[PDB]
Design an enzyme around this catalytic site. Structure first.
Site, mmCIF file in Angstrom:
data_model
loop_
_atom_site.group_PDB
_atom_site.id
_atom_site.type_symbol
_atom_site.label_atom_id
_atom_site.label_comp_id
_atom_site.label_asym_id
_atom_site.label_seq_id
_atom_site.Cartn_x
_atom_site.Cartn_y
_atom_site.Cartn_z
ATOM 1 N N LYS A 48 24.179 10.933 113.352
ATOM 2 C CA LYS A 48 25.143 10.946 112.242
ATOM 3 C C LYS A 48 25.851 12.272 112.436
ATOM 4 O O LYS A 48 25.204 13.253 112.022
ATOM 5 C CB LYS A 48 24.482 10.977 110.896
ATOM 6 C CG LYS A 48 23.547 9.825 110.600
ATOM 7 C CD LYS A 48 23.159 9.851 109.105
ATOM 8 C CE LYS A 48 22.790 8.481 108.573
ATOM 9 N NZ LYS A 48 21.705 8.707 107.586
ATOM 10 N N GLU A 80 13.530 2.266 110.978
ATOM 11 C CA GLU A 80 14.089 3.617 110.759
ATOM 12 C C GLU A 80 13.346 4.244 109.545
ATOM 13 O O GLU A 80 13.008 3.607 108.538
ATOM 14 C CB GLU A 80 15.589 3.726 110.541
ATOM 15 C CG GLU A 80 16.174 5.038 109.988
ATOM 16 C CD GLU A 80 17.647 4.975 109.676
ATOM 17 O OE1 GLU A 80 18.084 3.940 110.204
ATOM 18 O OE2 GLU A 80 18.317 5.792 109.047
ATOM 19 N N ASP A 123 15.871 9.390 111.294
ATOM 20 C CA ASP A 123 17.104 9.650 110.558
ATOM 21 C C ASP A 123 16.908 10.905 109.669
ATOM 22 O O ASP A 123 17.405 11.946 110.098
ATOM 23 C CB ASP A 123 17.632 8.418 109.853
ATOM 24 C CG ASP A 123 18.707 8.651 108.832
ATOM 25 O OD1 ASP A 123 19.468 9.635 109.059
ATOM 26 O OD2 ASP A 123 18.767 7.851 107.857
ATOM 27 N N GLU A 167 27.552 -0.878 101.857
ATOM 28 C CA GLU A 167 27.638 -1.181 103.284
ATOM 29 C C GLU A 167 28.025 -2.634 103.599
ATOM 30 O O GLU A 167 28.238 -2.902 104.786
ATOM 31 C CB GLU A 167 26.329 -0.827 103.937
ATOM 32 C CG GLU A 167 25.816 0.572 103.640
ATOM 33 C CD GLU A 167 24.964 1.108 104.782
ATOM 34 O OE1 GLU A 167 24.338 0.363 105.568
ATOM 35 O OE2 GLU A 167 25.034 2.359 104.756
ATOM 36 N N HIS A 216 21.035 0.281 96.245
ATOM 37 C CA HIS A 216 21.777 -0.764 95.554
ATOM 38 C C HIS A 216 21.367 -1.587 94.389
ATOM 39 O O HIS A 216 22.260 -2.012 93.614
ATOM 40 C CB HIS A 216 22.331 -1.706 96.680
ATOM 41 C CG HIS A 216 23.263 -0.868 97.501
ATOM 42 N ND1 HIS A 216 23.138 -0.630 98.849
ATOM 43 C CD2 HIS A 216 24.364 -0.190 97.111
ATOM 44 C CE1 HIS A 216 24.115 0.152 99.272
ATOM 45 N NE2 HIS A 216 24.871 0.421 98.230
ATOM 46 N N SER A 251 25.433 6.207 114.136
ATOM 47 C CA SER A 251 25.549 5.695 112.752
ATOM 48 C C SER A 251 26.686 6.264 111.927
ATOM 49 O O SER A 251 27.375 7.267 112.013
ATOM 50 C CB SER A 251 24.241 5.852 112.037
ATOM 51 O OG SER A 251 24.024 5.483 110.734
ATOM 52 N N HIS A 252 26.937 5.361 110.948
ATOM 53 C CA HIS A 252 27.901 5.453 109.882
ATOM 54 C C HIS A 252 27.150 6.110 108.720
ATOM 55 O O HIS A 252 25.945 6.329 108.744
ATOM 56 C CB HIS A 252 28.382 4.056 109.393
ATOM 57 C CG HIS A 252 27.411 3.138 108.799
ATOM 58 N ND1 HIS A 252 27.773 2.019 108.115
ATOM 59 C CD2 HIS A 252 26.063 3.173 108.667
ATOM 60 C CE1 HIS A 252 26.705 1.373 107.647
ATOM 61 N NE2 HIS A 252 25.610 2.045 108.003
ATOM 62 N N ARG A 253 27.929 6.363 107.720
ATOM 63 C CA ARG A 253 27.505 6.935 106.459
ATOM 64 C C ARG A 253 27.863 5.775 105.515
ATOM 65 O O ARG A 253 28.673 4.902 105.868
ATOM 66 C CB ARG A 253 28.253 8.214 106.058
ATOM 67 C CG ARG A 253 28.077 9.420 106.948
ATOM 68 C CD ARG A 253 26.709 9.579 107.457
ATOM 69 N NE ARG A 253 25.548 9.883 106.737
ATOM 70 C CZ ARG A 253 24.893 10.918 106.222
ATOM 71 N NH1 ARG A 253 25.264 12.191 106.134
ATOM 72 N NH2 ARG A 253 23.591 10.745 105.880
ATOM 73 N N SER A 254 27.201 5.839 104.403
ATOM 74 C CA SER A 254 27.272 5.026 103.209
ATOM 75 C C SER A 254 28.724 5.056 102.747
ATOM 76 O O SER A 254 29.337 4.060 102.327
ATOM 77 C CB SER A 254 26.266 5.688 102.214
ATOM 78 O OG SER A 254 26.500 5.494 100.804
ATOM 79 N N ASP A 262 15.309 -0.216 107.690
ATOM 80 C CA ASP A 262 15.619 1.189 107.352
ATOM 81 C C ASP A 262 14.812 1.323 106.081
ATOM 82 O O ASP A 262 15.252 0.849 105.040
ATOM 83 C CB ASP A 262 16.965 1.755 107.109
ATOM 84 C CG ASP A 262 16.988 3.278 106.916
ATOM 85 O OD1 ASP A 262 15.866 3.915 106.884
ATOM 86 O OD2 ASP A 262 18.052 3.879 106.860
ATOM 87 N N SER A 303 24.471 12.134 100.858
ATOM 88 C CA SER A 303 23.686 13.220 101.478
ATOM 89 C C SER A 303 22.204 12.985 101.313
ATOM 90 O O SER A 303 21.786 12.737 100.170
ATOM 91 C CB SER A 303 23.986 14.558 100.795
ATOM 92 O OG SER A 303 24.538 15.620 101.543
ATOM 93 N N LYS A 334 24.926 1.234 114.366
ATOM 94 C CA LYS A 334 24.675 0.692 112.999
ATOM 95 C C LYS A 334 25.920 1.060 112.241
ATOM 96 O O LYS A 334 26.108 2.256 111.940
ATOM 97 C CB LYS A 334 23.329 1.293 112.600
ATOM 98 C CG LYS A 334 23.248 1.927 111.199
ATOM 99 C CD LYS A 334 21.770 2.220 110.963
ATOM 100 C CE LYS A 334 21.572 2.780 109.594
ATOM 101 N NZ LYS A 334 20.130 3.084 109.337
ATOM 102 N N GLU A 372 17.485 -0.814 104.041
ATOM 103 C CA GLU A 372 18.287 -1.674 104.842
ATOM 104 C C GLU A 372 17.435 -2.612 105.742
ATOM 105 O O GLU A 372 16.427 -2.359 106.393
ATOM 106 C CB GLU A 372 19.195 -0.859 105.742
ATOM 107 C CG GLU A 372 19.777 0.500 105.484
ATOM 108 C CD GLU A 372 20.577 1.348 106.380
ATOM 109 O OE1 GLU A 372 20.866 1.057 107.567
ATOM 110 O OE2 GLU A 372 21.036 2.457 106.059
HETATM 111 O O1 LIG Z 1 24.155 5.197 107.610
HETATM 112 C C1 LIG Z 1 22.912 5.483 107.351
HETATM 113 O O2 LIG Z 1 21.881 5.313 108.101
HETATM 114 C C2 LIG Z 1 22.665 5.653 105.844
HETATM 115 C C3 LIG Z 1 21.180 5.931 105.711
HETATM 116 O O3 LIG Z 1 20.366 5.566 106.797
HETATM 117 O O4 LIG Z 1 23.558 6.702 105.372
HETATM 118 P P1 LIG Z 1 23.357 7.471 104.025
HETATM 119 O O5 LIG Z 1 22.337 8.487 104.442
HETATM 120 O O6 LIG Z 1 24.649 7.996 103.652
HETATM 121 O O7 LIG Z 1 22.888 6.509 103.037
HETATM 122 MG MG LIG Z 2 18.464 5.964 107.239
#
Ligand SMILES: O=C(O)[C@@H](CO)OP(=O)(O)O
Ligand SMILES: [Mg+2]
Ligand SMILES: O=C(O)[C@@H](CO)OP(=O)(O)O
Ligand SMILES: [Mg+2]
Lengths: 436, 436
Positions: free
Chosen positions: A345, A295, A320, A211, A159, A372-375, A246, A39, A396, A168
């Site tokens: 997201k 981003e 984002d 990721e 990370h 986009s995906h989430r972590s 990112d 979050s 992404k 990223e």
């Molecule tokens: O998929 C995403 O872009 C990342 C952050 O940019 O998700 P989270 O926010 O969960 O790290």
């Molecule tokens: Mg981001």
């Protein structure tokens, strides 16, 4: 007819519980798994966890699970909602919660239902999910656009570390002629990256992020982008591969300043940068490396550094955390000319209608949309259908490592192949995938 | 009726191509994705890759893909094989290859068809895959047994280093009362492990293996098992969690000796151990930590050190590279009393019949069967149905991190829940899951 709406607890790519919804109709059971995105983004639909520390480290979703099973199911069955009618489904889901941020029932309990409903409406329609989504979004489907995959190859942020503040480092096979080719180029470059990485930093530099990116202990962004350019080269794909960044800048935003060297905390300050100084550092990187997207360059309420950088960027500026998929936040971003692309997201707004709805307004202001995906991902491939149906031209979904990730990339492999001539690959036009 | 048999190239957890087979019948399209297991085990069905270095690093499966599409499909359609009849399907697949090791058509091109066929036979039977597999294996299904998940939490071997020669360090929530509980305990312990890990070794120690285990730069096994016992404790589940080891000993086998300190190569020798000396080191660890299983303690043709250790082990001895899922190799292992459990890896023999067939003989010699994943996994959940239908009581599908892994763990979540009272969890009886 929706006959049953059920939910269970399952795991995400990080081993943290999340919600799984099953929707039964006359055509079968449809499932959805919600992502557990780290979050980050004040002003997003709230996540609902037990907070019980003696279980799942306090990250259970047993409540949320309950919200669905004991609250939503009963009402939803009763409502006799035509699943085809997505707005109708979400309006009903939001009506039950009654909060602007889905904090009564929780955004994880509502998403699941909202995503299952759309799958159940495709089956009934007898079309593939991407097609249904094209129909809910009123997107062109002549032809369909396959997007460039923005693959996270090297992770920072969350990370590991040196001072490398940046989160990223993405590669975007823009020069590919097919999705299938973009993924191969992508993959070829990635493996290269690992070897180069293992050689310079140690076998350990080699294990991966959340990721899938390698997580070398690097200092600066230059050193990171130097590493990536060598892999492009080495892989033999110079010129076909572009870079995306990112910064996830909310992260090192302090005292109205930005700390590019965090991880001390001998919080070395006089080196700390102001919106404008950072802008200069970015411009630096921009000319030195093939960067075509950035981003979150500035912090989430740092409206003026965005507006200001945006003026002279000349590349795609992705919002984002500044927008957290909240049309309210988008409209401002649009009126302030802060960015020109939206990181969509879905679990940030919590409903499919609301998600489409925010892309639609981004697209009407001439923005792009990076899906986009989430972590904290799942084996669920919903976002593959989603970037195609929306016709964004870009997605992404991580590095081409971890199946919570290949799972969506494999899915596009399948869609492209099935579309035959009816699909064109976004390529160099990824940003306005939609106008294509 | 099988009307079409097609194949495409997709990616594995490691970003390396692999084969995907789609089988069309009157009931729909069935899919299978084959695992790209780090190959290791002379005497296994051969893997078929292009070797073209200008593509996928030379790991394409375009041939294999061709073997299916141009060779197998045509013949298979024509054959009009009752998919229900699994032996019949595999006999036909093997007849076309005509090699003992599937090197004509390649084991990846044959597996795919063999696994799709079984899914297409379940649909037609109108039963869940685990049930079909119970039926092909002639296994008890009253009740069904859910197995303990042997979760790789800490990786060595392939992933990084010190001298820690050992490959995998698994946790087995044996004390759980349900599968659903074993996974939670599992997960709770895992997260603990990461924090402990990050604290002692650096944020970097935290990124993960191919399988999801943390890959700290450790020296000795003691130091590794000390780290795990602290996480059990810290997680509050002391006594419910047991340890499993995967020495993957072929790996440091040299001059009839074993090198527990590899990664020099100032191949320090006089320290090098003999079968018997290693046996003593294992016995050491055995009493000091809650170890209940050991995979590949001795090298793959080191028949005498196995036989000898086996005599006085008193815990489960898993044969992986010594047997490579080859009944020919099993029979010897059985007559030599080398081990008492078989690591079943389907792509090692290349056919479903052959796989069942090898478990059946292990089970008849009173062995156990640990069903297993490959290093290079997919989103395919085939092995979840497979350990249940075989009623083994144990499965090794990685850590509760990466969806190529949760994907199978989530699947058992679903099976357990669906079986209701008809499923009992193996627990402390994981080894003879089948006699239960
Ligand atoms: O998929 C995403 O872009 C990342 C952050 O940019 O998700 P989270 O926010 O969960 O790290
Ligand atoms: Mg981001
Ligand atoms: O899943 C397995 O057990 C591992 C080794 O034991 O597979 P691979 O041989 O691919 O490393
Ligand atoms: Mg092994």
């Amino acid at each position: 007819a929706v006959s049953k709406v059920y939910a269970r607890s399952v795991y995400d790519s990080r081993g943290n519980p999340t919600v799984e919804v099953e929707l039964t109709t006359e055509k079968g059971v449809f499932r959805s798994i919600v992502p557990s995105g780290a979050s980050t983004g004040v002003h997003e639909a709230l996540e609902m966890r037990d907070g019980d520390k003696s279980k799942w480290m306090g990250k259970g979703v047993l409540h949320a699970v309950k919200n669905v099973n004991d609250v939503i199911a009963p009402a939803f069955v009763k409502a006799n909602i035509d699943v085809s009618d997505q707005k109708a489904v979400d309006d009903f889901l939001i009506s039950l919660d009654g909060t602007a941020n889905k904090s009564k029932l929780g955004a994880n309990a509502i998403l699941g239902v909202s995503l299952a409903a759309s799958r159940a409406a495709a089956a009934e329609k007898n079309v593939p999910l991407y097609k249904h989504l094209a129909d809910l979004s009123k997107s062109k489907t002549s032809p369909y656009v396959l997007p460039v995959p923005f693959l996270n190859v090297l992770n920072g942020g969350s990370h590991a570390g040196g001072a490398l503040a940046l989160q990223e480092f993405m590669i975007a096979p823009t020069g590919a002629k097919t999705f299938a080719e973009a993924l191969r180029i992508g993959s070829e470059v990635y493996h290269n990256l690992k070897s180069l990485t293992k050689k310079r930093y140690g076998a350990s530099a080699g294990n991966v992020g959340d990721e899938g990116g390698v997580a070398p202990n690097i200092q600066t962004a230059e050193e990171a982008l130097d590493l990536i350019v060598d892999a492009i080269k080495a892989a033999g794909h110079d010129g076909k591969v572009k870079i995306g960044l990112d910064c996830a800048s909310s992260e090192f935003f302090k005292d109205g300043k930005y700390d590019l060297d965090f991880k001390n905390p001998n919080s070395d300050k006089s080196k700390w940068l102001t919106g404008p100084q950072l802008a200069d550092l970015y411009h630096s990187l921009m000319k030195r490396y093939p960067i075509v997207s950035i981003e979150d360059p500035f912090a989430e309420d740092d409206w003026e550094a965005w507006s200001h950088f945006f003026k002279t960027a000349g590349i795609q500026i992705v919002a984002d955390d500044l927008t957290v998929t909240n049309p309210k936040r988008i409209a401002t971003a649009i009126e302030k000319k802060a960015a020109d692309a939206l990181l969509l997201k879905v679990n940030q707004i919590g409903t499919l209608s609301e998600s489409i709805k925010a892309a639609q307004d981004s697209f009407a202001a001439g923005w792009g949309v990076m899906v986009s995906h989430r972590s904290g991902e799942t084996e669920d491939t919903f976002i593959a259908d989603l970037v195609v149906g929306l016709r964004t031209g870009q997605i992404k979904t991580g590095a081409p490592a971890r199946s919570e990730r290949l799972a969506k990339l494999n899915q596009l492999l399948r869609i492209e192949e099935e579309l035959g001539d009816n699909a064109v690959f976004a390529g160099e036009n990824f940003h306005h995938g939609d106008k294509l």
